[PDB]
Amino acid sequence: GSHMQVTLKTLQQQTFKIDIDPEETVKALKEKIESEKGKDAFPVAGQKLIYAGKILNDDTALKEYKIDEKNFVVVMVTKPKAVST
Numbered sequence: 141g142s143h144m145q146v147t148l149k150t151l152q153q154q155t156f157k158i159d160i161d162p163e164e165t166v167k168a169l170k171e172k173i174e175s176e177k178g179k180d181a182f183p184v185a186g187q188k189l190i191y192a193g194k195i196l197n198d199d200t201a202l203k204e205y206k207i208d209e210k211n212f213v214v215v216m217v218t219k220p221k222a223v224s225t
Contacts, residue, residue: 144202147212148173152181155212160202167198173215186220189213 144162146169149155156176160169166189174184189196191205191213207213 145209146202146207147209149212149214150182151216162203162207163201165198165201166196169202170198170215182215182217183219186218186222188216188218190216 142161143159145157145159147155147157158169158172158176160172170187170189171184174182174187191207192211194205196205196213
């Protein structure tokens with residue numbers, strides 16, 4: 141409807157269920173899980189997403205990856221590694 145739901149796996153051996161507007165970008169789907177699992181474990185500036193082999197984008201809308209309520213997506217984290225050089 142006005143929102144759509146997705147199943148999410150993580151690098152921490154768990155799975156969950158969430159819902160967002162399917163015409164928003166990955167940025168919306170990625171920000172909303174930090175509200176549940178925290179900056180200390182899933183920092184927005186340093187987390188990433190995969191749809192079973194596809195490389196998702198914070199600047200492309202969720203329906204263009206054709207994600208489905210009966211399939212799942214995987215989240216990953218790098219902190220980020222941003223340091224002075």
